[PDB]
Amino acid sequence: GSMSSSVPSQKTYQGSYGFRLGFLHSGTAKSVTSTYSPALNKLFCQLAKTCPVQLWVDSTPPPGTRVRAMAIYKQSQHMTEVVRRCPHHERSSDSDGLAPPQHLIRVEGNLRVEYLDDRNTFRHSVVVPCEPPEVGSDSTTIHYNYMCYSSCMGGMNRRPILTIITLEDSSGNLLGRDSFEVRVSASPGRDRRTEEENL
Ligand SMILES: *C[C@@H](C)C(=O)n1cc(C=O)c2c(-c3ccc(N4CCN(C)CC4)cc3)cccc21
Ligand SMILES: [Mg+2]
Ligand SMILES: [Mg+2]
Ligand SMILES: [Zn+2]
């Protein structure tokens, strides 16, 4: 589809503030809508359901810090192809009004969400202000939504993707980076259990 002339770095970088991702320990029951496999570093989730991702730091980042999410294809031969929604779902107009219909990754429950189509790389990303934990809480959670199945033909087309989360300062400079593989399917609990059986 759309071809980029670069590939974003995937290098894990904790940085000065000790940035890393956390996930709920949800298990693999049929009722789960998302579940994270530490052994695979892979999130399994359902189409358009909340995926809570925790942002952990050892120190408070400076004011105006933001958190960006971006998807890339995992396999080398696909990495320069921009990850985007399939034609069916793009023309489906199931947007909450804020998200571009071509974007795979949305953030829910945040009215300060900002979406970027990069003018040079053509990649899509979604960025929100990074907030410290709420009173009583230990971490900051962001609720992501994946708006296509991994099997959507004409979009991901059964190709595995990586989601890259970056902490950036107000000017856009990199403060930290982490990532995880994603599979979007109708049965994440079963898919995780099955893929873990095959290690
Ligand atoms: C923008 C976002 C990354 C942020 O500002 N942020 C995230 C977190 C935590 O996830 C933040 C804290 C924070 C960090 C750690 C703790 N705990 C207390 C006890 N636990 C077990 C270990 C450390 C609490 C709060 C603070 C400020 C920002 C922040
Ligand atoms: Mg990790
Ligand atoms: Mg090729
Ligand atoms: Zn789709």
Numbering used by the authors: 91 to 289
Task: Show the paper's wording.
The transcription factor and tumor suppressor protein p53 is the most frequently mutated and inactivated gene in cancer. The most frequent p53 missense mutations in cancer are found within the DNA-binding domain (DBD), where all mutations result in lower target gene expression through the loss of DNA-binding affinity. Structural characterization of these hotspot mutations revealed a druggable cavity in p53 Y220C, a mutation that indirectly inhibits DNA binding through the loss of thermal stability in the DBD. In this study, we identified the first covalent compounds that selectively react with the somatic cysteine in p53 Y220C to restore thermal stability to WT levels.
The phenyl–piperazine compound KG10 was found to have improved labeling (51.6% ± 0.7%) while maintaining a significant shift in thermal stability (ΔTm +3.21°C ± 0.03°C). Although KG6 induces a novel p53 Y220C conformation, the L6 position and overall fold in the Y220C–KG10 complex are similar to KG3, with an RMSD of 0.367 Å. The elongated KG10 molecule makes distal contacts with p53 Y220C, spanning from the core of the immunoglobulin fold to L6 D228 outside of the pocket. As predicted, the Cα methyl of the acrylamide is positioned in the C220–L145 cavity similar to the PhiKan083 ethyl, making vdW interactions with p53 F109, L145, V147, and L257. The piperazine makes H-bond interactions with D228, and a D228A mutation reduced labeling from 51.6% ± 0.7% to 37.2% ± 0.5%. In contrast to KG3, the KG10 3-position aldehyde is oriented into the Y220C cavity and forms an H-bond with the backbone amine of T230. However, W146 is shifted 0.8 Å away from the cavity relative to Y220C–KG3 and 1.5 Å relative to Y220C–KG6. Although we predicted the aldehyde in KG10 would interact with T150, the crystal structure revealed that the 3-position was facing the hydrophobic pocket formed by V147, W146, and C229 on the opposing side of the Y220C crevice. In addition, p53 T150 is positioned adjacent to C6 of the indole ring in the Y220C–KG10 structure, suggesting that a nitrogen substitution at C6 would further enhance stability and labeling through an H-bond interaction with T150.
